[PDB]
Scaffold this active site. Sequence first.
Site, PDB file in Angstrom:
ATOM      1  N   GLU A 153      -9.955  23.590 -19.260  1.00 53.44           N
ATOM      2  CA  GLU A 153      -9.152  23.452 -20.167  1.00 53.44           C
ATOM      3  C   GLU A 153      -8.701  22.017 -20.554  1.00 53.44           C
ATOM      4  O   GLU A 153      -7.898  21.673 -21.167  1.00 53.44           O
ATOM      5  CB  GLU A 153      -7.990  24.359 -20.201  1.00 53.44           C
ATOM      6  CG  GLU A 153      -8.497  25.740 -20.268  1.00 53.44           C
ATOM      7  CD  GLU A 153      -8.866  26.108 -21.472  1.00 53.44           C
ATOM      8  OE1 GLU A 153      -8.067  25.890 -22.420  1.00 53.44           O
ATOM      9  OE2 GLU A 153     -10.172  26.487 -21.599  1.00 53.44           O
ATOM     10  N   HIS A 193       1.062  25.099 -21.057  1.00 54.48           N
ATOM     11  CA  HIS A 193       0.496  26.288 -21.655  1.00 54.48           C
ATOM     12  C   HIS A 193       1.222  27.590 -20.797  1.00 54.48           C
ATOM     13  O   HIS A 193       1.015  27.292 -19.670  1.00 54.48           O
ATOM     14  CB  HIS A 193      -0.744  26.372 -21.786  1.00 54.48           C
ATOM     15  CG  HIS A 193      -1.170  27.758 -22.393  1.00 54.48           C
ATOM     16  ND1 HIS A 193      -0.780  28.376 -23.486  1.00 54.48           N
ATOM     17  CD2 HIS A 193      -2.032  28.613 -21.722  1.00 54.48           C
ATOM     18  CE1 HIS A 193      -1.223  29.601 -23.682  1.00 54.48           C
ATOM     19  NE2 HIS A 193      -1.848  29.871 -22.780  1.00 54.48           N
ATOM     20  N   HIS A 214       2.639  32.032 -20.825  1.00 54.74           N
ATOM     21  CA  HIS A 214       2.714  33.248 -21.767  1.00 54.74           C
ATOM     22  C   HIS A 214       4.300  33.640 -21.785  1.00 54.74           C
ATOM     23  O   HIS A 214       4.594  34.598 -21.237  1.00 54.74           O
ATOM     24  CB  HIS A 214       1.851  34.211 -21.108  1.00 54.74           C
ATOM     25  CG  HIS A 214       0.441  33.639 -21.170  1.00 54.74           C
ATOM     26  ND1 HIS A 214      -0.582  34.631 -20.658  1.00 54.74           N
ATOM     27  CD2 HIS A 214      -0.251  32.829 -21.886  1.00 54.74           C
ATOM     28  CE1 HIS A 214      -1.931  34.115 -20.858  1.00 54.74           C
ATOM     29  NE2 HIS A 214      -1.436  32.950 -21.479  1.00 54.74           N
ATOM     30  N   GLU A 218      22.372  25.297 -29.029  1.00 52.82           N
ATOM     31  CA  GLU A 218      21.745  24.180 -28.663  1.00 52.82           C
ATOM     32  C   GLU A 218      20.047  24.068 -28.929  1.00 52.82           C
ATOM     33  O   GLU A 218      19.722  22.752 -29.068  1.00 52.82           O
ATOM     34  CB  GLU A 218      22.158  23.837 -27.114  1.00 52.82           C
ATOM     35  CG  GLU A 218      23.584  23.485 -27.065  1.00 52.82           C
ATOM     36  CD  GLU A 218      24.253  23.435 -25.607  1.00 52.82           C
ATOM     37  OE1 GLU A 218      24.757  22.422 -25.230  1.00 52.82           O
ATOM     38  OE2 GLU A 218      24.198  24.417 -24.701  1.00 52.82           O
ATOM     39  N   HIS A 225      -0.286  35.598 -27.924  1.00 55.17           N
ATOM     40  CA  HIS A 225      -0.823  34.823 -26.912  1.00 55.17           C
ATOM     41  C   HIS A 225       0.402  33.989 -26.169  1.00 55.17           C
ATOM     42  O   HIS A 225       0.192  34.072 -24.864  1.00 55.17           O
ATOM     43  CB  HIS A 225      -2.032  33.863 -27.271  1.00 55.17           C
ATOM     44  CG  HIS A 225      -2.565  33.073 -26.124  1.00 55.17           C
ATOM     45  ND1 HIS A 225      -4.077  32.807 -26.122  1.00 55.17           N
ATOM     46  CD2 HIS A 225      -2.110  32.656 -24.743  1.00 55.17           C
ATOM     47  CE1 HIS A 225      -4.265  32.145 -24.880  1.00 55.17           C
ATOM     48  NE2 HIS A 225      -3.309  32.233 -24.294  1.00 55.17           N
TER      49      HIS A 225
HETATM   50 ZN   LIG Z   1      -3.292  31.646 -22.437  1.00 54.68          ZN
HETATM   51 ZN   LIG Z   2      26.809  25.442 -23.572  1.00 55.90          ZN
END
Ligand SMILES: [Zn+2]
Ligand SMILES: [Zn+2]
Lengths: 274, 274, 274, 274, 274, 274, 274
Positions: free
Chosen positions: E117, E141, E143, E171, E212
């Site tokens: 990757e 990356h 999930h 925030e 994903h």
């Molecule tokens: Zn993934």
């Molecule tokens: Zn705060």
Amino acid sequence: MQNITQSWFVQGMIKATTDAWLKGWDERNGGNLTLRLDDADIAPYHDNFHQQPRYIPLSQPMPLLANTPFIVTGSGKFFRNVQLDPAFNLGIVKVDSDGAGYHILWGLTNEAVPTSELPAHFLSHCERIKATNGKDRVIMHCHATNLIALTYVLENDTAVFTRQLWEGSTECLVVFPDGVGILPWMVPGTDAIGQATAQEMQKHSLVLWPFHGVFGSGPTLDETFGLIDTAEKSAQVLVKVYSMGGMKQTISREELIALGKRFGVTPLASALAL
Amino acid sequence: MQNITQSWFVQGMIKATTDAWLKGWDERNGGNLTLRLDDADIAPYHDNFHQQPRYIPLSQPMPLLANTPFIVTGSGKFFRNVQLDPAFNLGIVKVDSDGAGYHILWGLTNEAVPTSELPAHFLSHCERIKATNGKDRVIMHCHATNLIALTYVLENDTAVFTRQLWEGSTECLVVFPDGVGILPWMVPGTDAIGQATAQEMQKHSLVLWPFHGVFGSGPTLDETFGLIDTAEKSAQVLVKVYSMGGMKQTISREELIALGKRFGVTPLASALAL
Amino acid sequence: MQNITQSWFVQGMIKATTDAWLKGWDERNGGNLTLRLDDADIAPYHDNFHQQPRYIPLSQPMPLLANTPFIVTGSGKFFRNVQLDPAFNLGIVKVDSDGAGYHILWGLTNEAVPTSELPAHFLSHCERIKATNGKDRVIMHCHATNLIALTYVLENDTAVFTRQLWEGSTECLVVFPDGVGILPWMVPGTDAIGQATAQEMQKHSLVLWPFHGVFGSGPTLDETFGLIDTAEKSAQVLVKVYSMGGMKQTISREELIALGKRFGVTPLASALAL
Amino acid sequence: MQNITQSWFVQGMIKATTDAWLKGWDERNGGNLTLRLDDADIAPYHDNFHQQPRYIPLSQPMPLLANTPFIVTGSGKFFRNVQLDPAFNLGIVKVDSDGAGYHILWGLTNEAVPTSELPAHFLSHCERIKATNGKDRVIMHCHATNLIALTYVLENDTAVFTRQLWEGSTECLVVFPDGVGILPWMVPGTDAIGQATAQEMQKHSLVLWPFHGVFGSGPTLDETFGLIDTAEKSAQVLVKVYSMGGMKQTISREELIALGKRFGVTPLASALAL
Amino acid sequence: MQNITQSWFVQGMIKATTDAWLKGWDERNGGNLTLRLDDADIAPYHDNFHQQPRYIPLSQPMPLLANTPFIVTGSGKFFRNVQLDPAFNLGIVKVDSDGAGYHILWGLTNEAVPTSELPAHFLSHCERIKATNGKDRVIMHCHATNLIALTYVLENDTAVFTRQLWEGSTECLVVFPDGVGILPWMVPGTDAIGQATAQEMQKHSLVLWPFHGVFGSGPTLDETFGLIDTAEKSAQVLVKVYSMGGMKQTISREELIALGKRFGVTPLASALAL
Amino acid sequence: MQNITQSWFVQGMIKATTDAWLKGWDERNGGNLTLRLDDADIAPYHDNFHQQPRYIPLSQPMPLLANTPFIVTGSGKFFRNVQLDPAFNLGIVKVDSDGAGYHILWGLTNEAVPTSELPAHFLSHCERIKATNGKDRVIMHCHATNLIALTYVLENDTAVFTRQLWEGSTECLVVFPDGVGILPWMVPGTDAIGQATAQEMQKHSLVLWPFHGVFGSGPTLDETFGLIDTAEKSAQVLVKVYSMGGMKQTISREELIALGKRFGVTPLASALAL
Amino acid sequence: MQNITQSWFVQGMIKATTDAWLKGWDERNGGNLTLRLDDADIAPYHDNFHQQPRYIPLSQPMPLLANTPFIVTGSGKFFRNVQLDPAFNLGIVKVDSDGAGYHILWGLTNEAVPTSELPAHFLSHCERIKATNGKDRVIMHCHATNLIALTYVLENDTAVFTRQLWEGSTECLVVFPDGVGILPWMVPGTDAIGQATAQEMQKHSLVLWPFHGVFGSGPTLDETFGLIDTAEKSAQVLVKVYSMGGMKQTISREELIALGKRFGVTPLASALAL
Ligand SMILES: [Zn+2]
Ligand SMILES: [Zn+2]
Ligand SMILES: [Fe+3]
Ligand SMILES: [Fe+3]
Ligand SMILES: [Fe+3]
Ligand SMILES: [Fe+3]
Ligand SMILES: [Fe+3]
Ligand SMILES: [Fe+3]
Ligand SMILES: [Fe+3]
Ligand SMILES: [Zn+2]
Ligand SMILES: [Zn+2]
Ligand SMILES: [Zn+2]
Ligand SMILES: [Zn+2]
Ligand SMILES: [Zn+2]
């Protein structure tokens, strides 16, 4: 229940062997330790014991030890390794109902003779139990280094050796007033050395094997270890002193006498008379 | 609040006893340590102290110590074990309002006489407080091995012993310029040895008991331990040197003189004159 | 002897409170746990217990609990904190000879009422001892989150609530065949809620307090914790299921019947009949 | 002296931030905590403080806080990281003699504005000190997840929100009888939100910021954390309940009334009247 | 030199993967992390790198990344396992002099394609380096669970999704003013998804893959992890809110506008306009 | 960035002091260690350094050390304590642009003269840098016990002392072929001893101070510690040998010659000629 | 699979080097250890080995070692450091199919000659394999301190040295009945010393190098370490004894004879005859 390794007595066994390995007293498989337990100590852990345990008969039965449980180091086991794998290196055993033999309930490995030195220990436990009305529970053998060294240079005589050891640290007289017993060198692991050590154990919590090591007794692991450590501390100091050319001054007889009186102990006469 | 075991002073007590056990200085129950605290040290932990604490009167009151708290090792306790169970092996105590006795606020076990050696410590704390305008806070007894050994071969004379110790490592003169006090051997745990040690403590942070051990003082645990360790390091070096046949060369008198001048200390004259 | 903190039962208390804190069941001081011990459990540690312990009389004596020791969480103590300072947050207590009150042998802090909830526990221990011929030893209260939530949406009816809980994980029926007892909301810490819970404990190892929490019983800490965790796991699954719009299918009555038969338990009839 | 990281108050700061990170309440740098200390707390550590510390003046002086020390999380610091590097993520500060500003004695990093949120905290400490006769010492802001979620679905009204929270776990009424204060959403880090929160803190230990988080107060770190955790536990239960379609039954007004009477607290009337 | 595992950057890699595993974001081998290092970071450890490292050419050269080192998770590696064996699960790589390929200097296992990757990561590092004048160094990356769930119920539209996320915690607007980029679902591990994500990375530090997971960027591991955690915290709150029937009130457009102005950021206009 | 304590060089400082404390070489505050760093080592941690650091001018400027950073033990600090509080006991310093003085960027305590021995170290770093073309980076002083002891019995003569040390373990000749330099006893902490040691450091990596200790140099902490440990291991063996009455046999001159040839080193001629 | 560092044999290597460092036997890089493994030991870890490993031809092929794997300490590595970075300090190697050389599958650093001493080890493994029918698997070199010291004072004669060592602890005769082999001093790292040691290894598990150290063999790491520790324990005791003026009494010839008979070993005749 589970966590038998964390029980007070397995933890105590790990402490005493580990401490002795760190002191430099138990090279290789040199050393042995056994502790007399009560049924109530092991009862919560029944769960963990073999339904069909190995039985090892004894050559001379010991009915005084009937139905009595102990935790013990295996023969051939290294003190250093006990902390790493308590179950491989220790065993819990129980003497049968007429003291004709013992069953291994837990621990140790599958060989012929996992506890070779246990008959000798048992003989000495018996004498210590009679000698102290059941207070002593531990028998410990290690190769205490300075005590060994002294056996090549001091007279191998209870009175002479006890007297030097008392002189080498003030508190020794109070810790072992009855003195240290001594034997001639003998072949290890024999009936003779077993019987002879047990006979010394009639009148001594601490016995020297010349050119080999020490054999001691006490009501608890701490007290036994602490007895050996005290005499070995004395020996260490004496090795230094002798190595520097010998005593210029020391504790005097009448000082040793007053010490015994203040602490309420009666010191071995032969050692005092020197 | 909780976590009293993690307080700076319980943690310090564990450090100093553990360190001394590892040095080989405190076999069995050999050794004692007490540290003078301030009310503000223990105030956050009030929560933890008995509503009805045990009271132990003193034989000679010490009004200088009135309302003063201390943390202490119990009598019969093993330095080795302090790290494993701080609360079983240490106690926090507080001297009452006219210094006629003390209350055990926390820790230790339920026996008669859990702190047998505390009267002797108190007597010496008093002298050290007067001697240093309140800077000294620790009294520590241990069985420092090489220092013990030297008491069998060196003259038991403040001046002679101090001089060898100064010679055995350069910095000793600066660490204990006032020298080490010495006593004849005496029976331990007696009024006489307590009083006699306290009298030496008038002019010395460090006092030798021949064939037994050392008794030292300091403003902090580190400084006290470090004083004993420094003199015991010297002794260790001297044991080696004497064992190899004695000094061929050493620090000279006028070198020891210049050392004291540079560091701004006035060395014990009797020891310098040798 | 020392190391009481490492005893099997102090270690078990730390495990169960810590586990429950981690589950999210015991915010702040919400929760209580007591475990019935035997004299032989605490006998090795006698050393550590107050010579003059605090006595707290009971309002209704409990002679069934005469001379019985327990380890317990203090009132106002946080489950989260037990692992950090076992001695501050737990206490060992012992019911006197006619069960008119109890003495605090060890642990906890110096306040008035360190164990406010202990009378209520004792009442329930009594019922559980009678109900199980002395097998149950633990009473545990915690604020099990999904079980609480369900008390706002399910009928507050033993049969209805038990049936949903059985349906929510297969093994629930086998773990609590006698079902969960329920009470109306009541003011906590009152005689009434104490008595009412004890009456439910006659026929249930597990009792719900609506909008508050759960109260459970078992022969060991693991078994009690595991009973609560099982019903709370069911509740967790049901919260999800109801939140997704309700059951499309479930365990059927005749499936629940066959389950009880195979495992040899007789399920609460009222719950089966639904 | 050394080991300031192991002091009771640095250890407490690590405990409370770590606990909150584990709860899921303080993503990134979301959250702040400050604790009011006494001079005697930090005095033993003087050793460690800058001889020339950074000074930051305040916009509105606070003479009530004159000469007062605090330990605090830095602005921009992650709760998660405090346990890994206490000194980088915490600071000890001290308000000067007329409360016109503060000096950073220890900790934190070298930027402009290491403690941006401290003026807002100080304003709220002042109100809490007046409101409790000096008992409150902590101000804690975190992003308590279920409490945040509820601010999108419940009426943003003190009485309504307090009442649901009381209903969601029995003990809430006793823990915060005065109820939770609420504000409209406001821009964070502004004077207005600082002043407005402080005004709510006049009558509330706990204040909600809608779509943002909670701001709470207490005499100790445990009590403050435990206040927030209790209200957030309620919220968690209510999220479940509402998500399952709402309450079928709940704690009734006259049940909430009897609760306040038994525990000796007077509940916010507006919330009771609903 | 040795101890490369304890280097700041291997330690940081262990922290970020472990943290993400604990959050529930990286089941199995789901997730990838790479961090751009400087030559001086790895230079002290040269000692440890293969004399003849494996070379893997790239399909599209990246001269912007010439001679640039990175530490990376291997393909097929489990985030959970990184703390247990950093060297098996991480690799250090270095892009050659014209960016036509990379050499594996350290770590990982002996398969064909240990870093499948990495080409996709490199493409995105390039865009982030151009977009931030070289400040961004991390591509991550994972999930993230609630963010995934929201992709089944919210419009898959940058403006709509960004706006909900901003509304879900105050925030968020300040942390990702440029909003979250989104893509249609695409087949993972393809050139197309690599290129398409990199194109989103031109204008976004954070990109959603529907059904994903998420793909994010930052100057440090803490800042990247903290960006993802902030948006995933919002998502978590929104899941609750939607699950309770939707917002009754929220942050208003003109409140979001004032937020951006106070913090000096310009919010994605399309998201503001809603 | 944070975690400076876990940086390779703070970790190395902790390792070397701790190791030396465990060897018995650094009682109290006896010992000092400094390590020359590169700007890139400390650059990642800039975050942690005082905006306005303390400046200490030097008496003799050292332009060779201009802009050079070092990590160092504080004066008065105990090696034993470094592992417990690295920041209290170590400091990072940086020599200014014309080497007229140094700034303390991080660590240590607030006294006058936290690094008293640093001028002496700097003088020796200079000589070692010239002597090794910039390879040596460490200067280490400790009180190596057996080496000290030997200074009372061996001729205080480079050639004689080097020869015994070479004879006492085979590899010594290869580790220090240039031999050990020696000085007469001198008052510590003086310009004279600083200058005199630096002059020995022109031709020796290892220098003896009689009745005090050793001063050594190396390219890395491991190599410096390992140089001292090797010569101190020799000394230890010689103490034993001399104590047993002296050498009966030893390494012969022509054996020492062949050793130097095989390993490609040229041994100090004066020592060989004996 | 992963976790190769936690494999039984990497863990054993760490134990034995660490233990030896703690004994004081392996200053700097003094010492080497290699262990003969089986293919099945390393097969689960294939995953971790270089696809193209470094090949080092041998000067004399060893077909007895064909296709045989070993784990080994690198040349120049410090025993002390092995526990800190097993992979940097150990290597796994495998002898090729006709024993003409070996490949480095895992571990160590990228230099020319990472295992300089391995040819010498291999030669000795061969002799030990022939001598014990394949039971011996370890070759260990360390600088055992008291054994070294004794080489300056005892006759460098197998029979004389063996006899003293047997006399110095009872069990030595049983542990090494075949005695210790001895060589004249020789230049280390040479073919001659390699060949000469291997020739001694034909009839001895333990070989002395005067003024340098010991070289030993065994079926397991524990047994090899324990062999060296036993002889070094004897030596330690003898150093003390000789230092105190020599033996006054000892184990007698006919006692040593009876010892060998009881334990079933045949002692080196030349040593018995003395
Ligand atoms: Zn993934
Ligand atoms: Zn705060
Ligand atoms: Fe006798
Ligand atoms: Fe005097
Ligand atoms: Fe019922
Ligand atoms: Fe209000
Ligand atoms: Fe976009
Ligand atoms: Fe020279
Ligand atoms: Fe031979
Ligand atoms: Zn033996
Ligand atoms: Zn004493
Ligand atoms: Zn409750
Ligand atoms: Zn020095
Ligand atoms: Zn060697």
